[PDB]
Amino acid sequence: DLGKKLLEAARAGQDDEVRILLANGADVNTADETGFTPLHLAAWEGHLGIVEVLLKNGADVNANDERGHTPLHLAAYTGHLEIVEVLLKNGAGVNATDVIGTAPLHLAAMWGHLEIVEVLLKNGADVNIQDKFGKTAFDISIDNGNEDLAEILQK
């Protein structure tokens, strides 16, 4: 119902409709079939203003989808630096791990998002974290052919 409209409005970037739906009772943390909340989708699509609106309306900054991804996971994956910064300023768990043991630092390094890597480390990213395959952000950097980025992620 309203929750379904809120998810799509956040995905499509309709920030006026997001506010309208929230003003009319829409659950800010509505989750779709796969566990994505409006904050997940806005982070994935790169809608900074909607991220800020949802957070001002009680959104769960650390909501987990069915795979354990938080909004910070999706922002780091898609390379949205401004959203990464805002999420961290709003208490995002910098070292959250998904069901495979992957943290946001793994995903930023997977695609060579250097600025995002620095921000995560600046906010306490732990480089020793290993996913279930034993791969640290350092190792992931090597496997994905991101060598110069592996100097900052040693150990």
Author numbering: 13 to 167
Publication passage describing the model:
A series of rigid connector modules replacing the DARPin capping repeats allow to combine the individual DARPin domains in such a way that their distance and angle can be altered to test different geometries, bringing the binding partners of the DARPins into a defined spatial arrangement. The two helices are not just joined end-to-end, but instead the two domains are made to overlap in such a way that the joining helix is stabilized by contacts with the domain cores along its entire length.
To facilitate crystallization of the unliganded constructs, we used the internal repeats of DARPin D12. In the context of DARPin-β-lactamase fusions, we observed that the paratope of this DARPin has a high propensity to form major crystal contacts, leading to crystal formation under a wide variety of conditions. The unfused DARPin D12 has been added as reference. In the crystal of unliganded DARPin D12, the paratope-paratope interaction is split into two interfaces (i.e., interacting with different molecules) of 498/473 A2 and 405/438 Å2 of surface buried, equivalent to 71% of all crystal contacts made by D12. Additional interfaces are provided by capping repeats and by bridging Ca2+ ions. In the absence of its ligand, the interactions of DARPin D12 are weak enough for constructs containing this DARPin to remain monomeric during expression and purification. Upon crystallization, the paratope-paratope interactions of this DARPin are strong enough to form prominent crystal contacts under a wide variety of conditions. In summary, DARPin D12 can form five predominant types of interaction with its paratope in arrangements with and without local symmetry, compatible with numerous crystal forms, involving both non-polar and charge interactions, while it shows no dimer formation in solution in any fusion protein under the conditions tested.
